[PDB]
Amino acid sequence: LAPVVPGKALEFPQDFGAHNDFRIEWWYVTGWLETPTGKPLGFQITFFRTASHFAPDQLIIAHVALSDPAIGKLQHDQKIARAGFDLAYARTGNTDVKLDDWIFVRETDGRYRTRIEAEDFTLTFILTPSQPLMLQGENGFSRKGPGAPQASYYYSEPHLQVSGIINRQGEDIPVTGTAWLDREWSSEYLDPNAAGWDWISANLDDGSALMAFQIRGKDDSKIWAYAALRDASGHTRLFTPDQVSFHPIRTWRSARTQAVYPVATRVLTGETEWQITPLMDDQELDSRASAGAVYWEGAVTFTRDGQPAGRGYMELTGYV
């Protein structure tokens, strides 16, 4: 029901909780891990809600992945449930999100705990904030297209410290890491002339946080674009669509879907050039059989004007 309009200030801790009066809501976690041997792994977790004893009226959709270069492709799992019916089974509420056993919870102290038991791995993590949260756009009002209604309320928690345990092959391993949380809600999806989006975020080594995206038209026009850099002084610089562009360095073709992705790319935010290198090429996640789509969810490293800068994720949609 509820529209996204400017001049509405976010308030915390209230706006950590679900926004069940809106049509759509996202909880998106991306990060890098380190095992006891020093080996890196990437992971991501998505929950997405959109709006009777069996009828699919309100829905919670989720997917998870682990990126291990030793495997060379994702290990992933994906689920969807009807929400509103059995809050014990599937719900988005004041402190958590739950789909079957998959759960994501915010503690009173601000720490996130999550247990995600998938087919080939389990993630049991604590994600501990280290910085103030980062409002996107204009104090959380973040535009995603030229139309007046084409906007989201949107913030991020960058530089989440990761602790906890991954189970794989029935073997518990403790990990450390750093992660990023996006929180977005709206009553309108992207314009349907959009083929898809490209999104990146980066936990930069100096403490800075970067997020950017573009919306791709089916005609290969740039429907919209955005970026925000919060520097080590805590100042956020915002970039207009004019100032953000994407420039592939290298493409990879999926043998599963035949889609062709810019897995390595250069992203310009004003006069600053960020280069994105993938941990591995095949980070494609096909969730179509759980009412999803084919996404590239890949852990990537960033350089800035040619120097090492940090680590993060890149998500690419609408390439099939």
Numbering used by the authors: 24 to 74, 83 to 351
Provide the publication's sentences verbatim:
The first structural representative of the domain of unknown function DUF2006 family, also known as Pfam family PF09410, comprises a lipocalin-like fold with domain duplication. The NE1406 gene of Nitrosomonas europaea, an obligate chemolithoautotroph, encodes a protein with a molecular weight of 40.1 kDa (residues 1–356) and a calculated isoelectric point of 5.0. NE1406 adopts a lipocalin-like fold with domain duplication.
The final model includes 643 residues in two protein molecules (A and B), two CHES molecules, three glycerol molecules, one sulfate ion and 394 water molecules in the asymmetric unit. In the NE1406 crystal structure, the two lipocalin-like barrels lack the large internal cavity that is typical of lipocalins and also the long structurally flexible loops at the open end of the β-barrel. We therefore propose that this region, which encompasses the calycin signature, acts as a ligand-binding site, the shape and accessibility of which may change with natural ligands. The two barrels are stabilized in a perpendicular orientation with respect to each other. As with the glycerol molecule bound within the N-terminal barrel, the CHES molecule is also fully enclosed within NE1406 with no exposure to solvent, suggesting some flexibility at the interdomain interface to accommodate ligands.
